[PDB]
Design a protein around this ligand. Structure first.
Ligand SMILES: *Cc1c(COP(=O)(O)O)cnc(C)c1O
Ligand SMILES: *Cc1c(COP(=O)(O)O)cnc(C)c1O
Lengths: 297, 309
């Protein structure tokens, strides 16, 4: 019933929790209708990040497209959650994973990925060269199935088929979905879903100031979020609501809170679902949660 | 379905996941019966640690005992998971939390509590922290010390949560393995399981004397926690720090589960117990607690290079 044979079954169905203290207005009142933030706690996933969804889907789809025979190696240009997600996803699914990432990459990140069983190959430039290094590696070697998070539709699909529905199920009265925009899968996937099922839903992109998965006709809005607002929001979230989200959630919160504030001001009702893509746990080391908002980090 | 008005409702019903690769024998073979490890993922709780269960319980029980009126302060001598849990739980429940901890305690720990809303008062030269929290709580009628080491609600949160959940998910359970810190988990889930499944083994993973294992306490080392009932435990597996870390590394590496170090101790116990069942040809369903995730322990360096204290 909550018994799984594999950690993989423990994927998605992440809780959606109301932020009573953070919501502009939790209860409908004399002063107007409720403006509610609901956090979709994607950290409750296997590796503790939203990406388990795309990672598993990417893999499963590769299995389906027959791209992926037993014991094959998945090659992925990533150093973070996607890598973690895939490391656990791959290994649990009988695959090996190699992450391509720049030589520059922080020991922590890679020490992490190594921990989860990923093999590492180094790129050289930034992430692009990795995505580009990984693009040549994949190509130089047939044995290696590059899943490519930034372009694999299965990424988007994982939200179209998990996050979205789960959201709609828990929050039929949703008015706003706010999620970070990296790969774009979440907003595109959960985005497309929600737009198909609830009319006038807002799909709000939190971009932390062109993804192959990006679709321009899905996002309704795009908040650009400064790193300071992100951290302060992250700080506020855990401080106020007891949820310890990673930094990207700060972005989202900020957007959600913005969107919240507009709806409050407009006396409109808002049930805003916002994604907590991941926990702060990974981000502690950054020093971001303690100290000056001044974050040279 | 899984929609919550508060984080507090997203407490417990933690997933129980089979460790098919780490299990001594996942599949029953016409030769021998299966010996399965199932990991109760307690890190899937609000603050990411089992403690959210006794934290909440302890508060609601204090609410219940009328100890704890609105905006009262919870005073707890803690600097770890229970603090975090409480910090989350108290705030959500409209209380304030002060953690009493030594002046010695790591910025990391304190900075963490601070971020969850806890107020910090420092003790001095962990034991002296208790007296101070207590002497400090026997002084303001509005400062309520929950005292995880003795508060029955702690035990009770596993008697009422962890234990039932397990049994619901693993009616075939033969073994419960958990760390022994405050003792709540083993006591509570221990008592529960003992009462509902015959022969169930409650196995304490206990750091070896000297070897610190985060979260875990050896019963001979410090104060025996007031909650501790020897009769409950079926066995105590001593576990060295190195096995705990190597086990935590194996767990993530083999099962993709990134657990805190106390889990490694538990895994080690579970695996030992598993290996005895295997060897004896006994069927084992061993549920073992993953009290928290590895995330807080990265900083420790416990997950780079295996020798390192
Ligand atoms: C991947 C990720 C995002 C952004 O999600 P995209 O789907 O890819 O748009 C945000 N936050 C965290 C923690 C992520 O891992
Ligand atoms: C508290 C804790 C334990 C032990 O729990 P008790 O209820 O004291 O038996 C084990 N592991 C971790 C990570 C803990 O925080």
């Amino acid at each position: 019933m909550t018994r799984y044979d594999s950690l993989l079954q423990a994927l998605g169905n992440t809780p959606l929790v109301g932020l009573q203290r953070l919501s502009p207005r939790w209860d409908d009142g004399r002063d107007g209708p409720h403006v509610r933030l609901w956090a979709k706690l994607e950290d409750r996933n296997p590796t503790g990040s939203i990406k388990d969804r795309p990672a598993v889907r990417m893999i499963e789809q590769a299995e389906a497209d027959g791209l992926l025979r037993p014991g094959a190696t998945i090659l992925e240009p990533t150093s973070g959650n996607t890598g973690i997600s895939l490391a656990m996803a791959a290994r649990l699914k009988g695959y090996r994973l190699i992450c391509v990432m720049p030589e520059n990459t922080s020991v922590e990140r890679r020490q992490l990925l190594e921990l989860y069983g990923a093999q590492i190959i180094f790129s050289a430039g930034g992430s692009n060269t990795a995505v580009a290094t990984a693009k040549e590696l994949a190509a130089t070697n047939p044995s290696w199935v590059m899943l490519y998070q930034y372009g694999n539709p299965a990424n988007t699909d994982s939200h179209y088929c998990g996050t979205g529905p789960e959201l709609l199920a828990d929050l039929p009265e949703i008015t706003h979905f706010v999620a970070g925009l990296g790969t774009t899968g979440t907003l595109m996937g959960t985005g497309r879903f929600l737009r198909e099922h609830v009319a006038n839903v807002a799909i709000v992109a939190a971009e932390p100031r062109v993804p192959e998965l990006y679709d321009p006709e899905i996002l309704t809005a795009r908040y650009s979020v400064g790193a300071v607002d992100a951290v302060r929001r992250t700080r506020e979230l855990v401080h106020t609501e007891g949820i310890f989200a990673g930094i990207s959630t700060g972005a989202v919160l900020h957007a959600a809170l913005g969107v919240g504030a507009g709806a409050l001001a407009a006396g409109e009702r808002a049930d805003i679902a916002l994604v907590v893509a991941d926990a702060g746990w990974k981000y502690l080391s950054t020093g971001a949660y303690a100290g000056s908002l001044d974050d040279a980090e």
